[PDB]
Design a protein around this nucleic acid. Sequence first.
DNA 1: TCAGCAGCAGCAGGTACTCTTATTCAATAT
RNA 2: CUAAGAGUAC
DNA 3: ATATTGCTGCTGCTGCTGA
Lengths: 85, 505, 171, 243, 97, 10, 10, 87, 166, 107
Amino acid sequence: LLVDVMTTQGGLTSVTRHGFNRSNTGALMRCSFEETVEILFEAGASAELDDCRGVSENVILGQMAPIGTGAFDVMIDEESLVKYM
Amino acid sequence: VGQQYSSAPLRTVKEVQFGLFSPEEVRAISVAKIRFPETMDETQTRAKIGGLNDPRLGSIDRNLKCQTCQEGMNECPGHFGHIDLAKPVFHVGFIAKIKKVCECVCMHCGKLLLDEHNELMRQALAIKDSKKRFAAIWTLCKTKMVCETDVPSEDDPTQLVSRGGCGNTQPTIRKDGLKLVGSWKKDPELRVLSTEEILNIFKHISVKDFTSLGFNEVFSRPEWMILTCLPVPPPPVRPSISFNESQRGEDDLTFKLADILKANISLETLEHNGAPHHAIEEAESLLQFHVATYMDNDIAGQPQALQKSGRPVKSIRARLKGKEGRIRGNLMGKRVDFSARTVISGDPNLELDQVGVPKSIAKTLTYPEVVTPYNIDRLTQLVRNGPNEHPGAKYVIRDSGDRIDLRYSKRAGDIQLQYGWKVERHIMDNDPVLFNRQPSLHKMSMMAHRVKVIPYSTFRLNLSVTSPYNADFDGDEMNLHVPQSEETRAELSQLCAVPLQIVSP
Amino acid sequence: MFFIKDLSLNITLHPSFFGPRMKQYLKTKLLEEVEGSCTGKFGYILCVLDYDNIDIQRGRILPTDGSAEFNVKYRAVVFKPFKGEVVDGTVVSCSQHGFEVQVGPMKVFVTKHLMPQDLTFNAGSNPPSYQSSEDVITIKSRIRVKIEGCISQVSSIHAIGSIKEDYLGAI
Amino acid sequence: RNSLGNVIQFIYGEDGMDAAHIEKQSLDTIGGSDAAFEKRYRVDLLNTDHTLDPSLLESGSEILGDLKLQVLLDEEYKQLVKDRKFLREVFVDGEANWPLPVNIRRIIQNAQQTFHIDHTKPSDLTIKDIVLGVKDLQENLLVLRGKNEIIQNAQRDAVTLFCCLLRSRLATRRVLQEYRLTKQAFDWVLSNIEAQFLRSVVHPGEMVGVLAAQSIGEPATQMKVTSGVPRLKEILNVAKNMK
Amino acid sequence: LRFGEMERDCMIAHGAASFLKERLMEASDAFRVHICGICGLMTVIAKLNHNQFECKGCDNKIDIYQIHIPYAAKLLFQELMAMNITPRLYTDRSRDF
Amino acid sequence: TXPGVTXPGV
Amino acid sequence: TXPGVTXPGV
Amino acid sequence: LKEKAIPKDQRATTPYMTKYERARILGTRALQISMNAPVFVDLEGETDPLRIAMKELAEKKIPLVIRRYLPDGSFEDWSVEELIVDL
Amino acid sequence: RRRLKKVEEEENAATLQLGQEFQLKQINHQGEEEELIALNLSEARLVIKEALVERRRAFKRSETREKELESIDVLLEQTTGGNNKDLKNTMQYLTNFSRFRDQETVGAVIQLLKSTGLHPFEVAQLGSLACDTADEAKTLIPSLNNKISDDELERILKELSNLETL
Amino acid sequence: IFVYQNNITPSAMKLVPSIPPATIETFNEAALVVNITHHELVPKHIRLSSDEKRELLKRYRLKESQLPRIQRADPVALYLGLKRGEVVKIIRKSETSGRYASYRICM
DNA sequence: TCAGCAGCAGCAGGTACTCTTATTCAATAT
RNA sequence: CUAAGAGUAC
DNA sequence: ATATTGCTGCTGCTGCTGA
Ligand SMILES: [Mg+2]
Ligand SMILES: [Zn+2]
Ligand SMILES: [Zn+2]
Ligand SMILES: [Zn+2]
């Protein structure tokens, strides 16, 4: 998995602020690693839109990340609930 | 009380849309115009109207409500103000971007130097990533120094097609500190590019031109990179943490905003009274320096704007960056409640998934249990026992939000529990608790144990479980976290339990 | 004018209410909330159509809360006034400044500036009414009015109409 | 996938298996000599060069000379030879011990200890039963549930090495002679292999990125040519010039 | 006690989303804030006593939402606004995944 | 770089 | 260039 | 949502309940029981909400459905009744 | 889009600017698109009556102007409770200014207006206002200018006057 | 395909892109002495047709950019003459499963 | 159709946790 | 508040 | 007499005649 992440862009992407952190993966989760304020300024100037799919975005917003137990939605079924009694 | 009922619908944030403030939006959202640098009036007992602590921006005293929303300091978010700048100034974080944009656009007519007629511009404009397209457009249009009012025809390089070019020579632009100096190639003419003319030439860029440069028509236009109206944060952003028990101590941002107001007033008076261009330029440079150091005090090359006390001023950028800044020090990782820490000792007589908890720690940490018909009797008994003896309850959270402290409540007599109330009670045996050793390098260093109350001052754990924790008993300390709801409790027992972590991935 | 429109409403149910009659509770709570309501987005909402089977959907549990959020969709009959539209009504009140005409659930105010010159107000005629040389418009009189203004309140939509136009007035 | 939805791996670990459910096991086809291979697996009903003892199973005195059963044995042994060639292509050094999800040896031992295999009574199994049961168990090991050619091919490719292990262990000669399974014991073994394989599949929602990062970082803390932390730093930080 | 970054990473690895959310919000700082629907800014005057909600600048009074975010997040957004950046928070998807 | 690991440059 | 990123030239 | 919802006849996900799904189902049901939700199983004297929810899951009387989200935004609805709890 | 602040054209029925939420086509709850059915006063009254009687039946399982007013008031008090002063006023208005009586005449009117093939808002306006002549109809409803021929307009308004039964 | 001894003058490199759909690919003899695809580290690369790419994107519900990338200067990409937008299936000898099939889109 | 060369300048730095100690002057004017 | 120093377990 | 102010890590261009 590590070497697949490092080579998935067609070249050797280092684990450094000049490597993985330069992708277009979301401003809020990119700024949480390094170069926070510069990333925010560039996102403001370019008007980037954050889909809030990352773990870091929901951690910042204090909401259940779509990971592990949050990777799905639990819903009540009216018909089954009536069916039980 | 927390926060009371609000009729507004409750949703979760799905998308964050970044951008830049337009001056008119800043003037629209603002609730007050700030004009005086004094925080307090001449009586030194009230908040000056129009000053930096305007009551319309939020209350600076607990005994008084916000003048705008009529809510206490608990509820009021704070409301922004605005300073109307005498002259435009550069945004310190966008000086390089402003330089690139003005280097990509004709400095006279506000049109991009190389239109689609050029061979390489089809390749450059076909780039879909906004940031890569700008890089290409810059690295191909930085070398052109004429507006090219007439260009060869695209069909064949024989006849000439005349576009809307103005036929002027573009200058070579460098930065000398906080200012951009342009040397026009001699048709050299070296002069400082006034932010007025840069703002004007940015405002003439066509929508198609700056939307090809990566900007947005709605959320961030290039001309909004120039500051003409400063948003003033409310006092919540910059609180006066007076620790002298009588003397108010203002935040660095308040002092910087006072300096900005002083420079703005000085420049306004100099312009109104008439003065030689030298003094006007000096005042303008001072205003630019104060604004830039307010937004970012770590500017390379320039000397730091020292605080009153001679120390460097803490700017907003310094407040945000660092392992101890907002992101890495208050959002990604923060201090939490319902936690304990103490020395650990081994116990061969404990089960693998058990942890021995000191009695005083068990009395301090509590779990809120919802009163139910199935547990009314034992919760009532714990409330009767009180908080001074274990097992017992420390608080009773009523449905109305009032919190009955069991200390000083025996005076009122016995409390009758109602279904739906909460009893915040001491953690008893068989409670799932997260248990951690701080140099946490993998998941198995944060497994979940079952509480066993013991009569001493050390956490007690099985010998076998010390290997995943990498913990000895030569003085090691470990931490304990108590879940506060049934969902967290359930997933902590069903996912992070010690037996489930025996075989590691 | 009267229409029927597709509307959706979000209802949150507490955990204690998930009994076998949950569908009945949701159907009743859609009523008493949007029945006979007044909004600027859809004007009036008088009644719900197709009450036999209202589309309630599944219902998602709000995490950490236990309450369930249902997005219930339905048909609702609405009455939205429109600028530039002619509608009938019954005169119910009159004054120096104008007169009020009941149309459905709403009141339309016709000002004195929008009556013909000979149709002047007069308090001598009982009730004080807008009278001309050929007819009088007193209380409980049918009238056609062309609406030209609308201002929206939560509890009462307000409208301003006119009766100067040709063949506008008493039928 | 990452947050953008980009595919990192089209199936996790190229097998879709949870790491905690993997144990080291030996592939018996890849190793050994050709004579040992034929003595281990080759069975011939028509000739006496590789015939099987009729006392091994109840029908051993009646299946002798059968033709359809011989066809099944021929295709089984051809599949085994193909598996040996494939495994030797995959693993150049010839190493036989590799981590795989389901431990067959323990299942066989459990069946032997549970049903009281007396090792003297002739086996109740029939050869057709063994061959068809193994062939069906191969088809019951589902990782991907899709219903198109792409997903079917991915599923078939995702279990090929475990299927090689399964054919290596549950061969006709090995079942009848070395282990001496009965009918019920063989059916029980098949059921448990299927259940354990379906239980060893990775769970969606697993945060494998953080798990991999921690599983690499922690041994580094526990830690001619450079090695150790400096070499790890040289690798992760893709450096043009190294020592 | 500091619930650091790598503690959060361990809890992510465990897959316990709700426990992490409860640690970062209910145990440390949970703050309710009202946001506009036309704009994503927190510039909503909310007089809860009189049941009034008004975003000056958009001239709306009927399209307001409330969210629960850490107070540190509110401070970060206000500091970004003070630094001429608009972190608009929207509660619906304008783009498909 | 950085600091650490200015810029570059500056 | 610059420096950085003399001139060119000098 | 009509386009997003994969029809029930051609769901392509595992019929087995994942560990995270089981943990969240137990947590959600225990939280609802703690807030006086009606119980769908007969109690043998147990008072802990978590073990009540465990008993409900053992004999499949939990009226909840999992909405499994595919990475493209589409989802499949699997009722707790039809999910096989092998773990 | 998600424009910060919002600019839009002002509502004007005479210009046929009904509004952003009252456009020609509306997506139904079934996922497809339908024409915005604009009910005239009689059709809307019949729809209200159908809805109320169906609600009465569903609750159960689990003419002169005086007597119609009594029936609507009794059934209204039986069906719905509070916050119905608006509904009471609407229903008494509907029974007071009603142009058509029963299902047959409203079906005839709607099929006639369908044969006219005009805008749903415009056909609802035509059915709501009991006009007499041609130019009078054209000036009552400004959207009628050069949409249907004079002979067809005159004849169809004549069947509006004829089907104006009781 | 053009094969040269040492180098191509830039005055000819500029005119190498001819009138479409004719494409000129230049290779060096020194770079073609050893067939890189025969190295054991190099797995099997199979170019996909347009219909195969469409089926691949349909079955996995992918967009164009959600696939792993291969540069249009990679030695195997030059060897197979990949053009941008074309997807190569990579067959690999995995050690957890016998066979693993990945996909890379040319860029 | 090809052979030879140069210029510069910038700081911080793993994860938790405990404790103690000291904290910017002088002159002018109201 | 800031700064500095001595540490404890890795 | 009291308050205001003066070790580690990179980044990029300009220019032909002669022989
Ligand atoms: Mg130790
Ligand atoms: Zn306020
Ligand atoms: Zn120009
Ligand atoms: Zn707004």
